[PDB]
Design a protein around this ligand. Structure first.
Ligand code: ADE
Length: 116
């Protein structure tokens, strides 16, 4: 509270570390469904069903232009990518499987990079 300073982690490397994690995501062989925005004019249903589209290129742009206030807002957008994918795709589909794989891949890197 007011003048009750809570000790907080060093956040000086967060931008660089998030960029590193995002690069590893971008280069994963299963990243292809997520590299660019879903084409809202070629994919029926997507615009109406998915209220907040997100993809790695949009995250990369926001990261590079200071649009994430903190690392938690970055993680929210990454997770949004995979939550959208689950919403729109069957688990037993290539894109569906790609999403689960990439979510697992992200969350381990997230834990390993920032949690202890
Ligand atoms: N091309 C695509 N079509 C439908 N859902 C997707 N989720 C990620 N990429 C997609």
């Amino acid at each position: 509270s007011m003048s009750v300073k809570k000790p907080k982690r060093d956040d000086s490397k967060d931008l660089a570390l998030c960029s590193m994690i995002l690069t590893e995501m971008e280069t994963h062989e299963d990243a292809w469904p997520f590299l660019l925005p879903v084409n809202l004019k070629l994919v029926p249903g997507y615009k109406k069903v998915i209220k907040k589209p997100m993809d790695f290129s949009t995250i990369r742009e926001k990261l590079s232009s200071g649009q994430y206030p903190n690392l938690e807002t970055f993680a929210l957008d990454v997770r949004l990518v995979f939550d959208n994918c689950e919403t729109f795709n069957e688990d037993d589909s290539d894109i569906g499987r790609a999403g689960h794989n990439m979510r697992k891949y992200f969350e381990k890197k997230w834990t390993d990079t920032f949690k202890v």
